[PDB]
Design an enzyme around this catalytic site. Sequence first.
Site, mmCIF file in Angstrom:
data_model
loop_
_atom_site.group_PDB
_atom_site.id
_atom_site.type_symbol
_atom_site.label_atom_id
_atom_site.label_comp_id
_atom_site.label_asym_id
_atom_site.label_seq_id
_atom_site.Cartn_x
_atom_site.Cartn_y
_atom_site.Cartn_z
ATOM 1 N N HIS A 39 44.175 42.349 34.169
ATOM 2 C CA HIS A 39 43.673 42.156 32.810
ATOM 3 C C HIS A 39 43.944 43.322 31.828
ATOM 4 O O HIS A 39 43.698 43.135 30.630
ATOM 5 C CB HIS A 39 42.198 41.778 32.795
ATOM 6 C CG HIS A 39 41.885 40.668 31.834
ATOM 7 N ND1 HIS A 39 40.742 39.906 31.968
ATOM 8 C CD2 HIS A 39 42.556 40.258 30.733
ATOM 9 C CE1 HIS A 39 40.775 39.041 30.966
ATOM 10 N NE2 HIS A 39 41.843 39.225 30.191
ATOM 11 N N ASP A 90 35.770 35.189 31.394
ATOM 12 C CA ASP A 90 35.773 36.194 32.475
ATOM 13 C C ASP A 90 34.407 36.364 33.092
ATOM 14 O O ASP A 90 33.406 36.223 32.403
ATOM 15 C CB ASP A 90 36.193 37.553 31.836
ATOM 16 C CG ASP A 90 36.905 38.534 32.746
ATOM 17 O OD1 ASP A 90 36.542 38.609 33.927
ATOM 18 O OD2 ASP A 90 37.832 39.223 32.267
ATOM 19 N N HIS A 112 33.622 39.340 34.126
ATOM 20 C CA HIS A 112 33.385 40.704 33.652
ATOM 21 C C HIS A 112 33.645 40.900 32.151
ATOM 22 O O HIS A 112 34.469 40.185 31.574
ATOM 23 C CB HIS A 112 34.295 41.647 34.406
ATOM 24 C CG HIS A 112 34.232 41.492 35.881
ATOM 25 N ND1 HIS A 112 35.129 40.698 36.549
ATOM 26 C CD2 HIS A 112 33.409 42.082 36.779
ATOM 27 C CE1 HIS A 112 34.833 40.820 37.834
ATOM 28 N NE2 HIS A 112 33.800 41.638 38.020
ATOM 29 N N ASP A 172 35.043 43.738 30.753
ATOM 30 C CA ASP A 172 36.271 44.530 30.553
ATOM 31 C C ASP A 172 36.240 45.447 29.288
ATOM 32 O O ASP A 172 37.260 45.644 28.626
ATOM 33 C CB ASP A 172 37.499 43.592 30.559
ATOM 34 C CG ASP A 172 37.652 42.865 31.882
ATOM 35 O OD1 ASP A 172 36.825 43.091 32.774
ATOM 36 O OD2 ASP A 172 38.602 42.086 32.021
ATOM 37 N N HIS A 204 41.902 47.756 34.098
ATOM 38 C CA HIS A 204 41.702 46.310 33.917
ATOM 39 C C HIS A 204 40.243 46.020 33.538
ATOM 40 O O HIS A 204 39.948 44.949 33.013
ATOM 41 C CB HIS A 204 42.213 45.482 35.124
ATOM 42 C CG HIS A 204 41.394 45.578 36.385
ATOM 43 N ND1 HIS A 204 41.471 44.600 37.361
ATOM 44 C CD2 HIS A 204 40.515 46.529 36.796
ATOM 45 C CE1 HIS A 204 40.620 44.969 38.308
ATOM 46 N NE2 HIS A 204 40.032 46.129 38.014
ATOM 47 N N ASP A 253 40.661 35.205 32.420
ATOM 48 C CA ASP A 253 40.779 35.817 33.746
ATOM 49 C C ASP A 253 40.355 34.716 34.727
ATOM 50 O O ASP A 253 39.312 34.085 34.525
ATOM 51 C CB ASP A 253 39.886 37.060 33.822
ATOM 52 C CG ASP A 253 39.872 37.848 35.113
ATOM 53 O OD1 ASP A 253 40.276 37.297 36.151
ATOM 54 O OD2 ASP A 253 39.384 39.007 35.100
ATOM 55 N N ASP A 257 39.120 34.866 37.574
ATOM 56 C CA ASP A 257 37.874 35.179 38.265
ATOM 57 C C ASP A 257 36.667 34.695 37.487
ATOM 58 O O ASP A 257 35.559 34.850 37.960
ATOM 59 C CB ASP A 257 37.746 36.663 38.699
ATOM 60 C CG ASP A 257 37.517 37.746 37.657
ATOM 61 O OD1 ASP A 257 37.062 37.415 36.520
ATOM 62 O OD2 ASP A 257 37.758 38.924 37.975
ATOM 63 N N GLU A 303 44.957 37.751 36.568
ATOM 64 C CA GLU A 303 44.286 38.154 37.794
ATOM 65 C C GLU A 303 44.493 37.193 38.968
ATOM 66 O O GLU A 303 43.734 37.255 39.935
ATOM 67 C CB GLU A 303 42.788 38.466 37.552
ATOM 68 C CG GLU A 303 42.566 39.631 36.586
ATOM 69 C CD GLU A 303 42.708 41.037 37.141
ATOM 70 O OE1 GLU A 303 43.040 41.191 38.340
ATOM 71 O OE2 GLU A 303 42.454 41.995 36.375
HETATM 72 C C1 LIG Z 1 31.980 47.882 41.342
HETATM 73 C C2 LIG Z 1 32.775 46.708 41.915
HETATM 74 C C3 LIG Z 1 32.609 46.668 43.441
HETATM 75 C C4 LIG Z 1 32.377 45.416 41.162
HETATM 76 N N1 LIG Z 1 31.850 44.355 42.045
HETATM 77 C C5 LIG Z 1 33.519 44.906 40.297
HETATM 78 O O1 LIG Z 1 33.749 43.707 40.241
HETATM 79 N N2 LIG Z 1 34.259 45.796 39.584
HETATM 80 C C6 LIG Z 1 35.402 45.456 38.716
HETATM 81 C C7 LIG Z 1 35.052 45.502 37.216
HETATM 82 C C8 LIG Z 1 36.291 45.250 36.340
HETATM 83 C C9 LIG Z 1 36.977 43.901 36.593
HETATM 84 C C10 LIG Z 1 38.263 43.762 35.744
HETATM 85 B B1 LIG Z 1 38.680 42.218 35.509
HETATM 86 O O2 LIG Z 1 38.876 41.585 36.712
HETATM 87 O O3 LIG Z 1 37.706 41.596 34.798
HETATM 88 O O4 LIG Z 1 39.810 42.065 34.752
HETATM 89 C C11 LIG Z 1 34.308 46.805 36.838
HETATM 90 N N3 LIG Z 1 33.376 46.601 35.726
HETATM 91 C C12 LIG Z 1 35.194 47.990 36.536
HETATM 92 O O5 LIG Z 1 35.141 48.532 35.453
HETATM 93 O O6 LIG Z 1 36.038 48.445 37.473
HETATM 94 MN MN LIG Z 2 39.176 40.527 33.293
HETATM 95 MN MN LIG Z 3 37.075 39.517 35.739
#
Ligand SMILES: CC(C)[C@H](N)C(=O)NC[C@H](CCC[B-](O)(O)O)[C@H](N)C(=O)O
Ligand SMILES: [Mn+2]
Ligand SMILES: [Mn+2]
Lengths: 318, 323, 318
Positions: A98, A121, A123, A125, A138, A229, A231, A274
């Site tokens: 992402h 999404d 998240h 991001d 990402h 995304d 996910d 993703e």
């Molecule tokens: C802390 C992790 C185990 C947790 N379970 C997670 O999902 N962490 C990713 C998150 C980013 C995901 C980017 B995406 O896929 O949306 O593009 C996070 N907030 C970051 O900043 O690393």
């Molecule tokens: Mn994302």
């Molecule tokens: Mn995501």
Amino acid sequence: VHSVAVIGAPFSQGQKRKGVEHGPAAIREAGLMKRLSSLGCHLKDFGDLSFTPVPKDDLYNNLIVNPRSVGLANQELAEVVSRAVSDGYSCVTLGGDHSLAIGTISGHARHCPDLCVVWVDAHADINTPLTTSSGNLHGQPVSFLLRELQDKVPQLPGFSWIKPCISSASIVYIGLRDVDPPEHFILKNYDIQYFSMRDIDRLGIQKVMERTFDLLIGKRQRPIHLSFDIDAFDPTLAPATGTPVVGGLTYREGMYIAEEIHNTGLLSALDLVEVNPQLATSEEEAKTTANLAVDVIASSFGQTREGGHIVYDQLPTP
Amino acid sequence: NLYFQSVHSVAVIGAPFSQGQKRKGVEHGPAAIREAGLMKRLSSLGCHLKDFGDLSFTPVPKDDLYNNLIVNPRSVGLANQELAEVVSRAVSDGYSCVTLGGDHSLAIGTISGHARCPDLCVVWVDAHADINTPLTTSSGNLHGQPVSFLLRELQDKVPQLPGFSWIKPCISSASIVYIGLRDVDPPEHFILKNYDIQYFSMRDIDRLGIQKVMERTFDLLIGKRQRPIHLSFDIDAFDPTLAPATGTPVVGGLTYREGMYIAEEIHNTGLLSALDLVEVNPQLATSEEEAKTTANLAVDVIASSFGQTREGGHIVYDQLPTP
Amino acid sequence: VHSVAVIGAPFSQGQKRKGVEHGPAAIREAGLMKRLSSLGCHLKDFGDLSFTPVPKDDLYNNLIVNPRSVGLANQELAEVVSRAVSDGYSCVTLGGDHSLAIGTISGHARHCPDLCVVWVDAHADINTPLTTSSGNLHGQPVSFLLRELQDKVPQLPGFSWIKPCISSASIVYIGLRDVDPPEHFILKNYDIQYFSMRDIDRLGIQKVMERTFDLLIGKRQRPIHLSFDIDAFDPTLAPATGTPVVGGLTYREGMYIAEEIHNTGLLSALDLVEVNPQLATSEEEAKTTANLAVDVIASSFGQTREGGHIVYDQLPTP
Ligand SMILES: CC(C)[C@H](N)C(=O)NC[C@H](CCC[B-](O)(O)O)[C@H](N)C(=O)O
Ligand SMILES: [Mn+2]
Ligand SMILES: [Mn+2]
Ligand SMILES: CC(C)[C@H](N)C(=O)NC[C@H](CCC[B-](O)(O)O)[C@H](N)C(=O)O
Ligand SMILES: [Mn+2]
Ligand SMILES: [Mn+2]
Ligand SMILES: [Mn+2]
Ligand SMILES: [Mn+2]
């Protein structure tokens, strides 16, 4: 009829899990071009971009991973998106992680001053390079694009070329279920409207789509950038992804979002990111994620659950 | 158990059709629903059962394809002529006729037989509209065309097929409501729109919710007057995760809860007069549990149509035993 | 900040399917303590209680299996629960089968005579020892606790200590889909309010929670006992359980129940029962159930899908 451009972005440096670079291939093999052709889309295949690799790009400030490569690959992508949009095409980008939305939104904003974003999404991001805990870019693309966050964002190496192009009132999130505390503060503090999985549980996907358009295009028509995304969907539907979060969108909700985006007539760009086929336990699970990605793109360009895309004129008579 | 909230007279007809399509194994559908405990479940609901058994179907020897497309026209038309007699007999005798499928071409027979109840209405639960005419179909399979033969308004677009001269259009456009639509052919979409046939696709269910869909379905059909109900339920209306043992599966279907909700609402009207449970094909499931889950789900639909509920309360309890 | 006591009750004698005793271990191994710590909870783990075994325990009225073993272990549990509630702690009991709710609700009601119960289950667990067909006590806990049912409940060996404390108006069920004819009779004749899967299909989980609190805490604030059977969730989400019933709560509905319980700020005790790791066909199905159980408890103590549980009010500046 829609003019649609397709760009392959085999990029993985926005995160640590390898294989997301194979995402554009898996979506193509799942029959994307054929599906868009069957809907009557005048297509232009820009192929899969070869990103200029950076040799020296080590960990920055003991936190940020590969900043030079991410900033560079995104500058290159921004030019290709700019070209597609200036040529008059709705621009579809196949990810890749992402972080690539930095490049696709920057490139699209070069032609649409009033562009709005629908970010689908699990998240937000929106971590800045100072709030991030993983240091993976990402999880940060929106911080570089939002105007209100410029003073909270340090200048990273390879990121000089980015100009914030969207305001906090011009992005709506759908599907949130895994938000970092600094991200929650950013969304609340800056009045960034979101419809988390909890909001959908209460309101339902119809009212969520109505309120999203009301916020973005209720006062005037604007080009829409859909940043999707994979996910956002439940990991049972989309298992081949790096950051899966249980309790996601169902297949029907996801088609509903895309269908409603199509019905505005304002879809101007779409990212579908993703998809990591290597992260699925079996070949069919990697294939399910890829086919789900095609369904989102097809529904964003007209595919419906009522079979009204191909128009019938007269029934044969005996 | 000796007390029940209601006592239903239910006729069970096994119709193992297969000639309405090309996938082999759907003829083993009535046997699969029986094996899953259908008769026992209906008895446990205090139903007076009349098992008409599993019907025998013999194919016509020289049954040539109409317009080099429509497969087995005479065998399908005649089997439905015979099925229509048994269904008319069961309904005339006062029974709620349950027909186990078999492919969906069997609804030509069940609906025609039932109508012999002229003011009936149809609730068609399916991923597909099965409303192709013999001229609009691309597969030739008659399971994708039954509604075309029954609609009065479509008669001018329907050619007289061999073994189908006996069929008289019995239902008007305003007397059939679809639920679950998600794989509609462009000619079917044209028919639904131009003939004003009311439907609730997966999209309408996404928006309104299954409760509003049932309320609006009954407003359109039995709103003006109390009318007998024919529920034609294709198992493919359910998500392939829940009902994999089927011929034409389509992703993004009815959840288990939605399907049970439709059946319970049908029961609560006290108007169910005939029910079809079609397209269970145990061979098309990758495993035994997948075939059993589909068969079990089919039993759940039929049971819920005759009183089985999530809350219980079908069986009446007298008093609690005292110590 | 929430003071939370974790009591491992490795019960098994309330039913015949062996393996449910290894439930508290499976929930702990799924990272329950780490998860509750990160929520800012002050934690006390009592570990897994060692209940006094009864080697000579004959079946009551040639039906009721293991009554003395169940009655005593619940008397031992009621003491621990009463001590944890005494020490300030919000009590979390890990199961073990659902007969352990006799103890947890008993212990809790000693200090909270005005408590109300939210029973989340596929089943009503309200068969009296004279209506049961299975003889499994995990299908009878509510009969012994309900005040209005006293004259229909016979005195079982090792059950004399039980004082009926909850009135019919102070228990609301959520998730009901497999209710026995005598259980339905009790619910309707004693005016016990419930929200079956059908009520959820019609109202939606938001309106269910609203109505639940209107019946229970609509006149005044009261302590909440949330007794949560993992089988309330669809077996696709919660497979590693003894009595699975198709068409259950989705993950999202379950999180919503828990989040709304948290939002009251009234949760005083919680039961997470019927996780049986043995009954899973694979290692992932056992871990899926255990991870789901951790998500429920965590959400009942503040874990959100929007991320606003941790206080964050100042963004870092570059
Ligand atoms: C802390 C992790 C185990 C947790 N379970 C997670 O999902 N962490 C990713 C998150 C980013 C995901 C980017 B995406 O896929 O949306 O593009 C996070 N907030 C970051 O900043 O690393
Ligand atoms: Mn994302
Ligand atoms: Mn995501
Ligand atoms: C007989 C079974 C096929 C049947 N479908 C069932 O689930 N039976 C268990 C019930 C008890 C459930 C206790 B729980 O898990 O909620 O704690 C029952 N009502 C009883 O009394 O044995
Ligand atoms: Mn059909
Ligand atoms: Mn169908
Ligand atoms: Mn239960
Ligand atoms: Mn229980």
